[PDB]
Structure formats: C-alpha cells, structure tokens
Amino acid sequence: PINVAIFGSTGSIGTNALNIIRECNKIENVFNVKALYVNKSVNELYEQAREFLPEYLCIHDKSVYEELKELVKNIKDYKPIILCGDEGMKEICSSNSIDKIVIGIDSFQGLYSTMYAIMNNKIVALANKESIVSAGFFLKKLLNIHKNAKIIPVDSEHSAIFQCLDNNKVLKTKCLQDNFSKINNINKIFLCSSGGPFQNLTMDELKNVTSENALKHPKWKMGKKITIDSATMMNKGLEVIETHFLFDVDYNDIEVIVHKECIIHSCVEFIDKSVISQMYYPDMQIPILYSLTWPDRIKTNLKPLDLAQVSTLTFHKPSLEHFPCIKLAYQAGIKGNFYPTVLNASNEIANNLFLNNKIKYFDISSIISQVLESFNSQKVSENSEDLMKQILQIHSWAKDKATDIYNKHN
Amino acid sequence: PINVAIFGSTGSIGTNALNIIRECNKIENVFNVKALYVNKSVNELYEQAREFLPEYLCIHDKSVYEELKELVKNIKDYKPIILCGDEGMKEICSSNSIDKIVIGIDSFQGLYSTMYAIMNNKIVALANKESIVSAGFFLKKLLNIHKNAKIIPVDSEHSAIFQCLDNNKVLKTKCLQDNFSKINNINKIFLCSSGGPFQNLTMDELKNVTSENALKHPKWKMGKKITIDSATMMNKGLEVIETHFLFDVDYNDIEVIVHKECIIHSCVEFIDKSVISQMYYPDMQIPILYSLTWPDRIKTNLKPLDLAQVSTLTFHKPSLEHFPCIKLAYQAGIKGNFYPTVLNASNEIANNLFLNNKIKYFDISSIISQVLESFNSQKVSENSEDLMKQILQIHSWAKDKATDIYNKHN
Numbered sequence: 001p002i003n004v005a006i007f008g009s010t011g012s013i014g015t016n017a018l019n020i021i022r023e024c025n026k027i028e029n030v031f032n033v034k035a036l037y038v039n040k041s042v043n044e045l046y047e048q049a050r051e052f053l054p055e056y057l058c059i060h061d062k063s064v065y066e067e068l069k070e071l072v073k074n075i076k077d078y079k080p081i082i083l084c085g086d087e088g089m090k091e092i093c094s095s096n097s098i099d100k101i102v103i104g105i106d107s108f109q110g111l112y113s114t115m116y117a118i119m120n121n122k123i124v125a126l127a128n129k130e131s132i133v134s135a136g137f138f139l140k141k142l143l144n145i146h147k148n149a150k151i152i153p154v155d156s157e158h159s160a161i162f163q164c165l166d167n168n169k170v171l172k173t174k175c176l177q178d179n180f181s182k183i184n185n186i187n188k189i190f191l192c193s194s195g196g197p198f199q200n201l202t203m204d205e206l207k208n209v210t211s212e213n214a215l216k217h218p219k220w221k222m223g224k225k226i227t228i229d230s231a232t233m234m235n236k237g238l239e240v241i242e243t244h245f246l247f248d249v250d251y252n253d254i255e256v257i258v259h260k261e262c263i264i265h266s267c268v269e270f271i272d273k274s275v276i277s278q279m280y281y282p283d284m285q286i287p288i289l290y291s292l293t294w295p296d297r298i299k300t301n302l303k304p305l306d307l308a309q310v311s312t313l314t315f316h317k318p319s320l321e322h323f324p325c326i327k328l329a330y331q332a333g334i335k336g337n338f339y340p341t342v343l344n345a346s347n348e349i350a351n352n353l354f355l356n357n358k359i360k361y362f363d364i365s366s367i368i369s370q371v372l373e374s375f376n377s378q379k380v381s382e383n384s385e386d387l388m389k390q391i392l393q394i395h396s397w398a399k400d401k402a403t404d405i406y407n408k409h410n
Numbered sequence: 411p412i413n414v415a416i417f418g419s420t421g422s423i424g425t426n427a428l429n430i431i432r433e434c435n436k437i438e439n440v441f442n443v444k445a446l447y448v449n450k451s452v453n454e455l456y457e458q459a460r461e462f463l464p465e466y467l468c469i470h471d472k473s474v475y476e477e478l479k480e481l482v483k484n485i486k487d488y489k490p491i492i493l494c495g496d497e498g499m500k501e502i503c504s505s506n507s508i509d510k511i512v513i514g515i516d517s518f519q520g521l522y523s524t525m526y527a528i529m530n531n532k533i534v535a536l537a538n539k540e541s542i543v544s545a546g547f548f549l550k551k552l553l554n555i556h557k558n559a560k561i562i563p564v565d566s567e568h569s570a571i572f573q574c575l576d577n578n579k580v581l582k583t584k585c586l587q588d589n590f591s592k593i594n595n596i597n598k599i600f601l602c603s604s605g606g607p608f609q610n611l612t613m614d615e616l617k618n619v620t621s622e623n624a625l626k627h628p629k630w631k632m633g634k635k636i637t638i639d640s641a642t643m644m645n646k647g648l649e650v651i652e653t654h655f656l657f658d659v660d661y662n663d664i665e666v667i668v669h670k671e672c673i674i675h676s677c678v679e680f681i682d683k684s685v686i687s688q689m690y691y692p693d694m695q696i697p698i699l700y701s702l703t704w705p706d707r708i709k710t711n712l713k714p715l716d717l718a719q720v721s722t723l724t725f726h727k728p729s730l731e732h733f734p735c736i737k738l739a740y741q742a743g744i745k746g747n748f749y750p751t752v753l754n755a756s757n758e759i760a761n762n763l764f765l766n767n768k769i770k771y772f773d774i775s776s777i778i779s780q781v782l783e784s785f786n787s788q789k790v791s792e793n794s795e796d797l798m799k800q801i802l803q804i805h806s807w808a809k810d811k812a813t814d815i816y817n818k819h820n
C-alpha cells in the first residue's frame with residue numbers, strides 16, 4: 001500500500017484526491033491515507049478523519065486546535081496524533097511511513113510544505129503551481145541535493161504533458177532537471193486552455209467584469225484564487241513558467257491554445273513533428289491519481305470518454321490584448337532572475353483585490369506590470385538557505401509594492 | 411547508421427519511405443537504403459537505383475529481369491547484386507547488412523516477405539495489413555520462435571496507437587504477443603477513419619457509385635486497392651482485426667470513429683480512463699519514419715501541425731447499414747479460426763471486381779458475406795509450415811469461391 005499525506009485536504013484538489021483514493025480502495029488496500037493537513041476547516045477535516053482515520057491530523061491555525069480535539073473525541077477506536085502549525089507539518093514530512101504527498105495548498109504558502117517534502121526525500125504530487133513559478137530555480141537546487149525526491153505534476157496540463165511523454169525516457173530524468181526536454185525529444189508544448197468565462201467578450205465588455213462573473217468558470221470547479229486566475233488567463237501565464245521549469249522547454253516553444261471544450265488537456269510536439277495529446281472530461285481525479293500511480297496506471301470506474309457524444313473539438317489563439325496577463329508572464333519568464341517571483345507575488349495581491357471588488361479587470365495586469373517594471377535584478381545566491389531567504393524577501397517586497405501601487409490610486 | 415530495405419519501393423508506401431529517408435538524411439546522415447524490391451516497374455526501379463545506389467536490387471517478375479540489368483549498366487561506378495523473384499527476396503531478407511525492412515507490398519502477397527523478414531530476425535516495418543489479417547495467429551507463432559524479430563506497425567492508426575504507449579512497457583513484450591494490452595494497461599482503442607468519399611451518401615446513392623468516384627479519396631493519396639477499401643470502409647474493418655492481433659485488444663474493445671479531418675489518427679484509452687492520441691496532418695511519412703526510429707525519434711523538417719489553423723475536429727459513429735463491410739470484419743474477427751483469411755481473400759476479389767466496374771457497391775459485402783457463410787471452421791495445424799500451407803489453401807479457396815459467386819450472379 002502506498003502511504004499518502006494530503007496537504008490542503010479540505011479544498012478542491014484535496015477533496016478530489018480523497019474522492020479518487022476512495023474509489024480505488026474498493027477491494028484492495030491500494031492507498032493508505034496517513035495524514036491530513038488543513039488551515040482552519042475543522043468541521044470538514046473531522047468528517048474526513050472519520051472516514052479515512054489517518055494517523056496524523058494537522059491544523060495550521062493553532063486557534064482551532066481545541067475545537068478539533070473536541071470533535072475528534074467522538075470517533076471511537078481512534079487515537080490520532082493531532083499536530084499544529086509549521087512544526088506539525090515538518091513532523092509529517094519527516095515521517096518514514098509516508099511515501100507520497102499531495103500538495104493542494106493554495107498560493108505561495110504551498111512552498112513551505114513542498115520544500116520540506118523534498119528535504120525528506122518524498123514523492124511530491126504537486127498541484128500548487130505558485131511554488132514552481134516563484135521558486136523554480138530553488139526547488140531544482142533542492143532536488144539536486146535530495147536525489148530520491150521527485151516532483152510529479154498534478155496541474156492538469158502538466159499531468160497531460162507528463163502522460164504524453166514516453167516513460168522509458170521520463171524515468172531517465174526528473175521534473176526540474178536540466179535536459180529534460182532533450183531527453184524526451186520535445187520540440188514544443190501546446191498549453192491548452194478553456195479560455196475561462198470571458199473568452200467571447202469585447203475589450204469594452206472586459207472593462208466591466210466583476211469577481212462574481214469571474215467565479216463562474218465554464219468547465220472546472222476549483223478554489224477562488226485559481227478561478228480568478230482563469231478569468232484573467234493569469235493561470236495560463238503561470239502555467240507557461242511552470243512548463244519551462246518542470247520540463248526545461250524554451251519560452252519560444254510554449255504555445256497557449258484556447259480549447260473551450262476542455263477535452264484535450266495539452267499536447268506535445270516531438271522533434272519529428274508528431275504530436276501526442278491527452279484527453280479526458282474536465283476532472284482532476286485523473287491527473288491526481290496519475291501522480292500517485294506513476295509510472296503505473298490502476299483501474300478506475302470513472303466515466304469513459306465518449307468522443308462521438310463530444311462530437312466537436314475546437315482550437316484558436318488567445319488574444320493578448322484581451323488577456324495581457326499572459327504577455328506579462330512570458331516577459332517575466334524570459335527576463336528570468338526573480339521576475340517570476342515578482343509576477344506571482346504581485347498577482348496574489350491583484351487577484352485578491354479584484355476578488356474583493358477593489359479594482360477592475362485591467363487594473364490587475366496594470367498593477368502586476370508596474371511591480372515588474374519596479375523590480376531590479378539581483379544576483380542569485382549560490383547556497384540554498386540564502387536563496388530561500390532571498391526568495392522570501394523579494395516575494396514579500398513585491399506584495400507590499402503591489403499594495404502601495406493600489407493604495408496610491410484607489 | 412540504419413540499414414534499410416524497402417519492399418514495394420515504387421508504390422505509395424515505398425515512395426513516401428524513400429522521401430522521408432532522403433529528407434531526414436539532409437539534416438543528419440542516419441539512414442542507408444540497402445535494397446529495393448518491386449514487382450514489374452523496371453524503369454521506376456532503375457530511376458530509384460540511380461538516386462539511392464543500393465547494394466541489392468530485386469524484381470519479382472522474371473520477364474523484366476534482363477531489362478533491369480540492361481538499364482542498370484548505364485550507371486557509373488555502380489555494381490549491385492541484381493536479383494529475381496522469391497529467391498532474390500529471401501536473399502535480401504537473409505543479408506546481415508540489413509537491419510530493418512519496410513514492407514509496402516500490397517495484398518496477401520505481402521505475407522511472403524513479412525514471414526521471411528521475421529524468420530531472419532529483422533525489424534519489420536509493416537504497412538501491409540492483409541498479412542496480419544489473413545495470417546495474424548501464424549505471424550504470432552513465428553515471432554515466438556524468432557525472438558529477436560519485431561513487427562513495428564506502419565499502418566497509420568496502429569502507428570498512432572504504438573506512439574501513445576510507454577516504451578518501458580512495450581519493451582517487456584512486442585506487437586502480436588498475447589497479453590500486450592494487459593502489459594500496456596490498454597482498455598479500449600478508438601480507430602479513427604476519414605470516412606472515405608461516400609461518408610455523406612444515402613443508401614440510394616451508394617447503390618450506384620462507381621469505382622471512379624471511389625478512387626477520389628478526400629485525405630490520403632494511396633494505391634488503388636486500399637483506396638477502394640477506404641470507400642467501402644473495409645479498410646477499417648481489416649484494421650479492427652489488425653488491432654486485435656497487433657495489440658491483443660478484444661473486439662468489443664475496439665471502436666471505429668469517423669474523424670473527417672484526419673488529424674487524430676487514433677486514440678488509446680487506458681485502464682484509469684485517461685485517453686492518449688497521436689496527431690498529425692494526413693501524411694504517411696510520420697508513421698513510416700517512427701517505425702524506422704523506434705524506440706527513439708529524430709529531427710525532421712516536416713511542416714509543424716498548426717492546431718489553430720486546423721481549428722475544428724469532428725467525431726461521429728459510422729453507419730453499419732451504409733458500410734456493411736465493417737460489420738462483416740467484426741463478425742469474421744469474432745468467429746476467429748481462418749475466417750479473417752476468408753474475409754481478406756474474398757474482399758481481394760470483390761474489391762477488384764468493383765475496381766473494374768463488374769459489380770455494384772452493395773455486391774461487395776454481398777459476395778464476402780456468402781463466402782464467409784460457405785466456409786467451415788477448420789482444425790488449426792500446430793507446426794508453422796503446415797499452418798502456412800493451410801492459410802494459402804484457404805485464401806486461394808476463398809478467392810475461387812468469391813469468383814464463383816460473382817459468376818453465378820453474372
């Protein structure tokens with residue numbers, strides 16, 4: 001049995017992970033849910049702990065500890081180790097009876113657990129794209145030091161790419177490793193997007209969109225932050241940088257394509273021009289399960305894709321005028337250095353401002369752009385503890401800069 | 411370098427093979443054309459000889475053997491082994507100078523060179539599907555005896571399938587082995603078809619279509635035999651049986667789908683319900699090239715797939731009332747034994763009868779259907795040599811039968 005920890009178990013990714021683990025555990029003890037880790041949702045965590053009876057339970061916010069302890073006492077035959085904060089997360093990460101960790105923690109915050117998972121040589125099923133975008137160079141360093149650690153992508157497009165490749169060649173390398181794409185004969189990546197709710201809007205219509213419209217994603221049910229990133233296509237911007245770091249593909253060889261049916265999840269063009277693509281309904285259970293079974297597959301009872309019923313697949317190029325967040329992500333990635341860190345940080349601020357009705361659609365890219373323009377290149381630290389400190393200070397600088405730019409105007 | 415023999419070098423498959431070989435060699439010299447083998451086309455063979463200067467030349471037809479040597483004398487500083495008929499073919503197959511053999515000979519005839527290529531432990535890049543359909547279980551026997559021999563599918567849909575797999579799983583087995591689909595975690599195959607030129611016709615219009623209309627394929631430029639088969643969709647019926655043998659996929663697990671754009675060449679559904687497809691423009695150079703480079707890929711200067719430009723892909727189920735040959739192949743395949751031999755043989759006659767305007771569209775399936783019911787399941791010989799003789803005898807019986815049914819009605 002594979003022993004799995006679910007980090008951010010009460011969110012969209014974490015719930016999907018538990019869902020598919022349940023379906024796969026019908027007869028055989030394929031997975032063992034050893035640990036659940038959330039921020040604040042004690043009631044929801046208690047419902048999950050009742051079903052999965054994990055050895056470890058961790059709550060980031062220490063103020064709900066008593067509430068957790070009190071709810072858990074009602075479950076009989078159950079004495080879990082109940083842990084708290086960063087300490088509790090580090091304990092679970094260092095446990096010998098944990099093989100694989102699903103990071104479904106949102107935002108920059110997800111980097112702490114990713115880093116600690118890697119330092120303890122775990123398999124990391126990483127949904128959290130922010131840690132890769134803002135700290136790609138650093139995780140590469142870490143994976144170099146902790147050679148048994150692996151990042152297996154959960155982000156649906158990156159899972160799709162991973163699946164399209166030949167495992168005979170993927171097994172001779174590692175995500176984030178130099179020459180990944182050369183070993184895998186990758187010529188270019190088609191990054192597929194639903195295009196989000198705003199894909200058919202004119203410029204003047206875009207000017208007026210609000211967060212409530214933005215939260216109605218046509219194809220994926222997700223947490224609020226990634227849903228807002230999908231409306232602006234900053235999500236796809238972030239995924240361009242994620243592609244570059246994970247798979248070592250040049251920015252000029254990453255193409256964003258709007259595929260509104262969201263059946264094809266991304267495509268790989270190899271050096272002979274043959275293209276391989278991965279297809280399924282829009283359902284995170286596949287990419288989540290694959291990260292946990294790779295390099296094997298296991299049987300599921302998920303609904304089989306009916307191509308005849310689907311009937312039509314369409315593709316077009318996205319408009320960079322309507323979705324300038326994509327342009328900004330390419331620019332930050334191409335500039336290199338800590339610009340992706342600045343991108344991600346200033347987007348976290350602008351995303352949250354827009355979610356809370358404090359700025360308009362085009363102010364998001366305007367704030368991000370200004371912060372990027374403000375930032376001065378810094379020499380990258382050679383050693384890892386200092387590079388991590390550098391990353392934290394720049395991220396934190398960029399959030400405060402975005403807030404100041406916001407406060408100057410509105 | 412890779413030493414290649416091309417069998418049927420003057421046909422559609424053969425001509426595209428030499429083309430991709432030549433083009434790829436302009437980038438980096440990796441292929442060497444060691445042998446060319448044709449039926450009757452002395453002049454076209456001579457023109458090809460002058461370009462590629464192969465070590466071996468062979469012509470199947472004894473009566474133009476002298477004409478060939480006479481033409482080949484005109485070439486400066488060139489002294490090749492010029493061979494003749496079945497013996498010349500066997501000679502080339504047994505040459506240690508030859509690594510891989512492209513079989514682009516049409517019809518049942520392609521079986522002879524396929525079997526000698528296997529007996530000599532070569533990589534067989536097999537385009538000819540009639541040999542798999544009428545002799546599948548015998549080729550399977552032969553590959554269990556000659557353990558270093560490999561069939562690498564060139565037929566475009568089967569190459570598509572093969573390209574979608576992980577080669578660390580493929581290398582644990584090989585094409586045409588039992589359990590291939592279980593080792594590769596295959597659940598279902600989607601076999602994509604252009605639909606041919608009659609895809610939109612009524613039953614009434616189909617009744618009166620002529621071979622001239624059938625030869626205008628909307629997507630693939632190919633030889634006459636397979637083009638006629640694509641019009642009736644018998645090609646896809648033969649391809650269902652070919653899928654079953656190459657990949658050990660159950661007949662109830664193979665789905666034919668009409669994809670009129672011919673961008674997606676086929677799809678593989680794995681046991682987790684994830685689906686992987688190979689995509690390219692309708693161009694046989696890709697599947698041919700891959701058969702010669704597997705398990706690697708090489709750079710080409712082929713036009714890159716522009717998904718935005720392609721814009722729409724469509725998928726629907728074929729009508730078995732309009733294309734009854736599809737039904738017949740499933741029925742023959744499910745029956746097993748020598749029924750596929752009979753299906754292939756009687757189609758060879760009906761196809762040719764239709765090509766030459768002697769019968770009407772629905773007479774094709776009418777004839778094949780009557781030959782099939784006339785056949786009786788026969789005990790399968792357990793030594794390879796007697797099984798082969800059985801196959802020839804049954805194939806030959808089926809052709810005489812089909813001819814005799816035609817003669818009755820005419």
Ligand SMILES: NC(=O)C1=CN([C@@H]2O[C@H](COP(=O)(O)OP(=O)(O)OC[C@H]3O[C@@H](n4cnc5c(N)ncnc54)[C@H](OP(=O)(O)O)[C@@H]3O)[C@@H](O)[C@H]2O)C=CC1
Nearest residue numbers: 008010011012013038039040041060105106127128222223
């Ligand atoms: N949802 C999706 O389909 C996809 C998500 N992703 C990525 O996955 C990540 C998570 O996304 P999603 O599931 O949608 O987000 P959600 O908002 O649904 O869930 C976030 C989860 O993380 C937990 N969490 C937040 N902070 C902490 C913390 N400090 N310590 C421990 N746990 C914490 C939350 O706990 P609590 O409930 O207590 O607040 C919650 O369980 C994001 O980075 C996103 O980009 C990527 C592709 C698709």
Ligand SMILES: NC(=O)C1=CN([C@@H]2O[C@H](COP(=O)(O)OP(=O)(O)OC[C@H]3O[C@@H](n4cnc5c(N)ncnc54)[C@H](OP(=O)(O)O)[C@@H]3O)[C@@H](O)[C@H]2O)C=CC1
Nearest residue numbers: 418420421422423448449450451470514515537538632633
């Ligand atoms: N064409 C295509 O794109 C595809 C073809 N296939 C399969 O590939 C095979 C070949 O098809 P295609 O190229 O279209 O056929 P063609 O009709 O274009 O050419 C057939 C070739 O085989 C040669 N030939 C015939 N008999 C013999 C023999 N006795 N000994 C040596 N050579 C012989 C012919 O020589 P000669 O010129 O002297 O007559 C010719 O070169 C078929 O089985 C077909 O089903 C499968 C998928 C796609």
Ligand SMILES: CC(=O)N(O)CCCP(=O)(O)O
Nearest residue numbers: 155156157193194195196230
């Ligand atoms: C499922 C997934 O991995 N996402 O990143 C959300 C995709 C949203 P869009 O398809 O880019 O709008």
Ligand SMILES: CC(=O)N(O)CCCP(=O)(O)O
Nearest residue numbers: 565566567603604605606640
């Ligand atoms: C290229 C190929 O492999 N063929 O078998 C001919 C295709 C015929 P259709 O696509 O089924 O009409």
Ligand SMILES: [Ca+2]
Nearest residue numbers: 063064066067
């Ligand atoms: Ca409290």
Ligand SMILES: [Ca+2]
Nearest residue numbers: 163164165166
């Ligand atoms: Ca794969």
Ligand SMILES: [Mg+2]
Nearest residue numbers: 155156157239
């Ligand atoms: Mg994604």
Ligand SMILES: [Mg+2]
Nearest residue numbers: 565566567649
């Ligand atoms: Mg074919």
